[PDB]
């Protein structure tokens, strides 16, 4: 079983600062890529950004609109995955989500990569927010 | 074109055999005498070779 | 950023209807980024389907998809009560931005 | 029925096995004696044999 | 920062290695000298050890 378990939610002012992360259990971030996405009450879903594992670079990639304010890090040391945000907006009123892909590819043979099992299990977290 | 003394003798058999790499599979087709193999699947087309 | 919009706007089915909805990018996005989400009102969304094709595992096979340039697909071939709730697409073009999210109701 | 100095010693693992032919598998379980198997992933189900 | 005379002297090859485990693989990231390596296809980062 892979949860995310997040936390870090609280009462805040755009006149402030507000740090949410998501610890793994199961699942480690050693190989996880990791993406927020926010939904506003009344709105659809927002990507926020994205950060690529540490081994594959750290890269991140941030949303325009909350690019700079919004940041993307990651722990790698207990699992996890944070996001800072600072000098916010009365527009960033929402639910916050962090969410991962698990690919899981058990083999049937160490001699061939040809026959084995698939499973993609889609993660999120509970949701925590950002309050104006 | 078969003549009556060899119907059934030979079987044009299809397998995925291995490559050069470990990621790499390759469609192959063989003639096979019909002594070196041996049927799996009772009316099925599956037949595996007589030493596995 | 990518932009996604939904037709029908609201999906009128009953259970066992084919509730199928769709929607438009305005990018020409490969198929094999497309992915769709149910969120069930109160829940996290949860991934159905991705590359356009991929079930995610534990979803039930009455939900595929298709799709090809700015064109794309979820049907679920018999509504189910379980199948209540807002759907998304997903376009990957360098960018995972969601349509607004349709609504399935009767 | 176990007793308590069998508290636990035993296990009932389940595994995928290889078997004759490469496109097949089977399931297949056995009991092993806890000093031969190591836990993977801390306090998990999932063990390895202790030398692999 | 790489002396012109180096230029296309090394290849950075991401690939998947096998495991103690038969039934997992893992991500590995290495630094290969180009006589060592050759492409399959061309216009396209797919390469492969040189004997194999
Ligand atoms: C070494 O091993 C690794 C093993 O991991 C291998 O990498 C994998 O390669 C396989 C194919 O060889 C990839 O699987 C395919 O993925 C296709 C599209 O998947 C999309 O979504 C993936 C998940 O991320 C998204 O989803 C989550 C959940 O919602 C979400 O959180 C995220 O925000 C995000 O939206 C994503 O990882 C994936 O990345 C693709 O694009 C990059 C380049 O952009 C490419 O490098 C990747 O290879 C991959 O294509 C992509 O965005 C999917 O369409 C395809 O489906 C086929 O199979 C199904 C059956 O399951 C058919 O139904 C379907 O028609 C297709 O035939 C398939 O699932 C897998 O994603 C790779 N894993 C990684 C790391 O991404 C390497 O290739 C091996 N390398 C070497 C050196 O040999
Ligand atoms: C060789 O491999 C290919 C690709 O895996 C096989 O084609 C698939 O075979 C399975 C059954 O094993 C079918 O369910 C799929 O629909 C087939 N897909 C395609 C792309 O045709 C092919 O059958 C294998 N050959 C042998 C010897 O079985
Ligand atoms: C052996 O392989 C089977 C599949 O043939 C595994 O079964 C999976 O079990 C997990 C855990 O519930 C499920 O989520 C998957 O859906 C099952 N797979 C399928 C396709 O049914 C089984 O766990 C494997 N056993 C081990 C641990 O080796
Ligand atoms: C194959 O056999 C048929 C008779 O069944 C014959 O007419 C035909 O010419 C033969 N093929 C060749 C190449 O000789
Ligand atoms: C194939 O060969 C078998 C003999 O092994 C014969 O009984 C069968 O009728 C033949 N089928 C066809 C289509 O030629
Ligand atoms: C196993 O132990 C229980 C008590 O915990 C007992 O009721 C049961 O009969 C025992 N089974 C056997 C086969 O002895
Ligand atoms: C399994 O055995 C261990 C060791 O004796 C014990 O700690 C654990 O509680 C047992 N679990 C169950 C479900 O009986
Ligand atoms: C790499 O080379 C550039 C010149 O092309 C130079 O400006 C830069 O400082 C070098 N990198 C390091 C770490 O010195
Ligand atoms: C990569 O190196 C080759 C020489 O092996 C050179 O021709 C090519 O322009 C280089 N590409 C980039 C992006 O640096």
Redesign the pocket.
Known sequence: EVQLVESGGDLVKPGGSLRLSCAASGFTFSDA???WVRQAPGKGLEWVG?IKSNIDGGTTDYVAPVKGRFTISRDDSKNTLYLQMNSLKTEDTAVYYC???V?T?DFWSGYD?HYYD?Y?R??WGKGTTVTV | NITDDMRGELKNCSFNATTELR?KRQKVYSLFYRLDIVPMGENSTNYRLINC | EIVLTQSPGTLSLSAGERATLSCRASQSVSS??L?W?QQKPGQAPR?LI???????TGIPDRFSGSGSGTDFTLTISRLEPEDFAVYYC?Q?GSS?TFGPGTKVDI
């Open positions: 890529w990791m993406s994205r969410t991962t892909g690919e590819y990569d698939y993609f889609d993660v | 990621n | 094999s980024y992915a989400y991934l991705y590359g356009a094709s991929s079930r995610a997903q990957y995972f």
